[PDB]
Design a protein around this ligand. Structure first.
Ligand SMILES: Cn1c(=O)[nH]c2cncc(NC(=O)[C@@H]3CCOc4ccc(Cl)cc43)c21
Ligand SMILES: Cn1c(=O)[nH]c2cncc(NC(=O)[C@@H]3CCOc4ccc(Cl)cc43)c21
Lengths: 304, 304
């Protein structure tokens, strides 16, 4: 029992982190096989960030201008290419610690672990979610660019995020491992504002199921609702609309607890309208939305 | 910017986890050098747990009754001894992945990362704190016993916790790596109730400093207080008394923000008396107390 914001064990990803320096900019890179992936803004000075022409800036860089260091040993760069907003630096040595891996582009609402790094060295691991406005709320200081987000399915690491930027509001933006930004963000030091950060309804419901599984049951009410009635309330509270696909996904948690998905929706509807009244659910005074239904099943079943 | 509940990178500890089975009980063990540490209740059946005489039960066990498996390979047990509530199983092979390590006994209020394991395999990593009542609020299912808590100082892992038990209220109890339980708990399936779970005041203040560093400043007020006046309020709200030692520890965060420790105490005093009024601090609707002042400095500075 007990339910925590849990990240995946980070060992498989720690074995992939390297330091990439180009000129006076140093950030992190991800070394998989004989390729090192890193944000293309490693080639920029602080002044270039204002209006960078990456293709033009890249012309002035050769393989020897990218310094890749794995631990305290230097890697030989034998090729470099730009793919969207990431650089792929081909090195002469395959990473001996390369885990089984995939590159996946996640959808909003999906969660992942982040291994925050500085100078190619891991500082910490935390869990976050791709927000509905395609930002993530992370913990990243200067030098953290190139840190990655991932999920693990047994022994296969699915890399979904690479950190690139912090917006003026303190939220974060980045790309998948093909270098495509999540959302409309661009790697330029220009005013970019995020859209509405709506609550991930299906994740809140999954977390209310986790609360029932762990004994926090005070919020269960005598009501039910329909998807349409619930969504009228969800719209009002800046919650994402719940679909029949989300109801299907919650099926196993509904089966485990015996609480119909629409009954849990009615409980959530009353929590939105009435508030918590100074009470907590799983140690939280707000409705947590960064646990997916899959995370709840995994944590409540002990998948390793 | 951004502030997350961050765990240490778990790789160094993942390389130490093994599966220990004695008869029909399987749990986790920690393999450091040629010794495997595990909860002594691995020798008990579910029936033995009601009133176990560990010395007597241990007489019926030989080295060959302890099955230690590292990955999918078996370790040869050449000795076994009981130290308080842990068994130390000497194996014929030193763990080749043994990191630099220490065994430390933490004080209440101190935080640590937990690598939750099942069958010697890591499932997740999360951060928690030794509560003032010597329980921890973890996430542990059956089979999680032997999972460890630790801190990392650069390349040295200080192991502080080994999981042993879940109380009827869903909170957790365990020992240091010398097998001594934190608090008054015993490894017996008997009614054991926890004392008051007071709030770790010095950690809340550190987290309010983290909030100011990250731009959440709405709660800063025009007041100050004294330790004595603050503690009158802290007592009333089941907060731990703040001492001059805690004030000294917060010194570097006070220097970084320019907010005197007693001014932050007055802000916290108003938050306790007035509540949050539906507002959040660092994404939380409650006052977070599982970040120590050291955690705040480390996360806000990027120690790797
Ligand atoms: C500089 N810095 C911090 O101090 N905390 C950060 C957390 N995450 C990221 C950064 N860095 C940035 O955002 C840089 C600084 C210049 O502006 C831009 C513009 C676009 C892009 Cl892709 C990157 C950057 C951080
Ligand atoms: C069985 N079990 C779960 O299902 N979730 C658990 C989370 N953490 C621990 C356990 N296990 C226990 O607490 C066992 C079960 C029998 O009672 C006792 C009594 C003392 C001691 Cl030291 C251990 C135990 C859990």
């Amino acid at each position: 029992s007990g339910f925590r914001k849990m990240a995946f064990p980070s060992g498989k990803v720690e074995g992939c982190m390297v330091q990439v320096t180009c000129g006076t900019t140093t950030l992190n890179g991800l070394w998989l096989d004989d390729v090192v992936y890193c944000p293309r803004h490693v080639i920029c000075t602080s002044e270039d960030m204002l209006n960078p022409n990456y293709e033009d800036l890249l012309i002035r860089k050769s393989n020897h201008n990218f310094l890749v260091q794995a631990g305290n040993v230097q890697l030989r760069v034998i090729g470099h290419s730009m793919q969207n907003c990431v650089l792929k630096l081909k090195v002469d040595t395959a990473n001996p610690k390369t885990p089984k891996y995939k590159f996946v582009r996640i959808q909003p609402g999906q969660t992942f672990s982040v291994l925050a790094c500085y100078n190619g060295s891991p500082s910490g691991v935390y869990q976050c979610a791709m927000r509905p406005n395609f930002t993530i709320k992370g913990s990243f200081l200067n030098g953290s660019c190139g840190s990655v987000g991932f999920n693990i399915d047994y022994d296969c690491v699915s890399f979904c995020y690479m950190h690139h930027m912090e917006l003026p509001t303190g939220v974060h933006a980045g790309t998948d491992l093909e270098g495509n930004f999540y959302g409309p963000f661009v790697d330029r030091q220009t005013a970019q504002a995020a859209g509405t950060d709506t609550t991930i309804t299906v994740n809140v419901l999954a977390w209310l199921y986790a609360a029932v599984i762990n004994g926090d049951r005070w919020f269960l009410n005598r009501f039910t609702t329909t998807l349409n009635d619930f969504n009228l309330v969800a719209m009002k509270y800046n919650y994402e609309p719940l679909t029949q696909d989300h109801v299907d996904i919650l099926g196993p948690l509904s089966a485990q607890t015996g609480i119909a998905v629409l009954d849990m929706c009615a409980s959530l509807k009353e929590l939105l309208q009435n508030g918590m009244n100074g009470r907590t659910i799983l140690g939280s005074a707000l409705l947590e939305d960064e646990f997916t239904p899959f995370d709840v099943v995994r944590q409540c079943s002990g998948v390793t």
